[PDB]
A paper describes a structure:
The fT3SS consists of the transmembrane proteins FlhA, FlhB, FliOPQR, and the soluble ATPase FliI together with its regulators FliJ and FliH (summarized in: Macnab, 2004). Overall, these findings show that FlhB and FliK are important for the switching of the export specificity from rod- and hook-type substrates to filament-type substrates during flagellar morphogenesis.
First, we wished to determine the crystal structure of the cytoplasmic domain of FlhB of the main polar flagellar system [FlhB1 (Sputcn32_2563), henceforth simply FlhB], which localizes at the C-terminus of the protein (SpFlhB-C; amino acid residues: 222–376). The crystal structure of FlhB-C was determined by molecular replacement employing the structure of Salmonella typhimurium FlhB-C as search model, and refined to a resolution of 2.1 Å. All FlhB-C structures share the central domain composed of a four-stranded β-sheet in its center, which is surrounded by four α-helices. This autocleavage occurred at the highly conserved 269NPEH272 motif and leads to two tightly associated subdomains FlhB-CN and FlhB-CC (residues 252–269 and 270–376, respectively). However, the structure of SpFlhB-C differs from the other available ones in two main features: First, the N-terminal fraction of helix α1, which connects FlhB-C to its TM domain, appears disordered in our structure. Second, our structure of SpFlhB-C resolves a PRR involving residues 356–376 at the very C-terminus of FlhB-C, which was not observed in previous structures. The PRR interacts with an extended canyon-like surface area formed by helix α4 of FlhB-C. At its C-terminus, the PRR is also in close proximity to helix α3. The interface area between the core domain of FlhB-C and the PRR is 855 Å2 of buried surface area. Our analysis identifies the following hydrogen-bonding pairs between the PRR and helix 4 of the core domain: K360-Y353, G358-Q349, G358-Q352, R359-Q349, R357-Q352, Q368-Q342, and Q368-A339.
Author numbering: 252 to 269, 271 to 352, 359 to 382
The structure:
Amino acid sequence: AQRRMMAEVPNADVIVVNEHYAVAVKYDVKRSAAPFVIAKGVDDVAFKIREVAREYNIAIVSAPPLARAIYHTTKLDQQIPEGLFTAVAQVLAYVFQLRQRKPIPIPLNQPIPDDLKYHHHHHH
């Protein structure tokens, strides 16, 4: 949650959002096979990421379990875990296929893996 992180949000391909979550995701294959997180924050920092993204016409999409799973499993400048690739790649496909405001609700097409979930859950 830095000015240095906030300066990177203009380079995002998408913000996955939804106590508030926002993760700014980039796909740049000359650097990494998997998308990577270039900004992330919760609550107010999440809304500052969103406001910058909207200023720069960067798609913001609501998929709450994906937003949370990315945030919990991916540090800044790190690739998302392999278990989230297909879900993020399908969000990216939708973003890239948009034609030339609340976030766009996108249904997930499969579950988020158990091992990337239950971050706040009290196990017995």
